[PDB]
Amino acid sequence: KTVLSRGYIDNAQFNPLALRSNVLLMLLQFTLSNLKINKSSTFTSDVTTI
Amino acid sequence: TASPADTNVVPAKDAPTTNSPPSTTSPNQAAADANQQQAGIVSSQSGPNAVGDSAPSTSVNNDGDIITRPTSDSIAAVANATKPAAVVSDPQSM
Amino acid sequence: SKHLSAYLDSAVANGPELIVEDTGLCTSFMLLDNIPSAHLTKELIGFTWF
RNA sequence: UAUAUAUAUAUAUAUAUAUAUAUAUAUAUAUAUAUAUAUAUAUAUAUAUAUA
RNA sequence: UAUAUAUAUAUAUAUAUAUAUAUAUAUAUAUAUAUAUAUAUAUAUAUAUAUA
Fold it and tell me: Pairing mode, if any, of strands B9-11 and C10-12?
């Protein structure tokens, strides 16, 4: 319900006619949310079996 | 000395249309006048430059129409005007 | 932001937040049990060390 | 069987009260910026008084 | 011309007051949504009374 839905859509409905744009924005937010650097942590040596 | 306020000047958010007064008559001319008056210029010093100009306004739709509420609400209004009842009660229903 | 005193309809530019780093796991999909188990007998407990 | 009255239950609408969320306005407190006024200090200019 | 004093103006600093803007917090009001309660109206069901 990101766009073109506020005001008229029911709380439990989605508008099929606006699906592509809503999906598009949803993916965009998904993309933006992950824009971060993969830092390196400390390490330990494993001695557990295999 | 090195005042950032004098070095980091950039247009503010909603700059192109912020000063537009809420009206329906001649929004672009009115907005243009508001910008001129807001900037501190007085008409007696701008002279002929003030008569024909026009500026973007919030009252004008992107399609080029006079709007009085956010376009989403206009979409909502027309949508709400057509909502047939989902479940109706009639004697012959099986 | 103690001062943002730009003259007229302007603003003081700030730098975008670029350096963001993560030390967890580089993932955004999760594995979960939608429906709980039936709580079966274990038949095997775990490792023994002495 | 139908109508009317009364009681109870359920549904829908409207009003009022209370709680929670969101928006807008107002008030109060604190911080920062700008303007104005008053006081004190320092510098400069002008006027007046006194001395040489 | 120089010195000293007083007054006025201007600049700079500090303090105090007031105003305006922005941020944060709290309170109140209004609007919208949701929940709960009460009242009123309408419909349906059940009971009782009266009439046909």
Answer: antiparallel
